[PDB]
Curated annotation (Swiss-Prot), chains A, B:
Amino-acid positions noted as binding Ca(2+) 1 in the UniProt annotation, renumbered to this chain: D51, D53, S55, F57, E59, E62
Cellular component annotations (GO), alphabetically ordered: cytoplasm
InterPro entries: EF-hand-dom_pair (IPR011992), EF_Hand_1_Ca_BS (IPR018247), EF_hand_dom (IPR002048), Parvalbumin (IPR008080)
Note: This parvalbumin has an isoelectric point of 4.25.
Function: In muscle, parvalbumin is thought to be involved in relaxation after contraction. It binds two calcium ions.
Name of the featured protein: Parvalbumin beta
Alphabetical list of PANTHER family matching this protein: PARVALBUMIN, PARVALBUMIN ALPHA
Modified residue annotations for N-acetylalanine: A1
Residues covered by the EF-hand domain: 38-73, 77-108
GO terms for MF: calcium ion binding
Amino acid sequence: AFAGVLNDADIAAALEACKAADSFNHKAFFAKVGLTSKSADDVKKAFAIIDQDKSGFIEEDELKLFLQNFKADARALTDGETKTFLKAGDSDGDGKIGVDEFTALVKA
Amino acid sequence: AFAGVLNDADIAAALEACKAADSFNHKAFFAKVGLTSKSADDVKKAFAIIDQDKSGFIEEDELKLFLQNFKADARALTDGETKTFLKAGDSDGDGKIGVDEFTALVKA
Ligand SMILES: [Ca+2]
Ligand SMILES: [Ca+2]
Ligand SMILES: [Ca+2]
Ligand SMILES: [Ca+2]
């Protein structure tokens, strides 16, 4: 769903780097895919895509499927990867990621 | 923000019909703009656009600005219009519209 927003080549490179189980790193991904240099606006658009059910939060099953929003056939993150990603972004400890937590996670 | 999803002509007709203060009717708008025949998926995409801050709910100030998501220079809804729209869609009475309430509002 990041057709004319990211860059096909950027997404491909990002995905190739984390193909191995437990090799994912959110900072490396965001930087490579080109999201870190985006406007708060486009970051909110990205958030909405990742929030599959539009609940206003990225819950753990949505996070597990993170890569699939970029390339449909991308692998699922491992439990370890998901938990690490969740822990890094979940500032208030409610177990999900809201738009502000997501924005801080992206912008670093 | 409904560039290749709606139809320029549909949006224009929809907007012309409710230009007068208190002339808005959500069922007439949705039918005219072509949202009622959309897949639950595209309806969720529309929801996300209307939910300006990505909180997961369309709050009353967002509802007031409903038309502005279709054409940037569209008028704001009146208080009467907003309240009526809110009342029609807010099934659980919490004062905001969640994705499921929005979907039912669209599909009729
Ligand atoms: Ca969600
Ligand atoms: Ca949180
Ligand atoms: Ca909102
Ligand atoms: Ca409600």
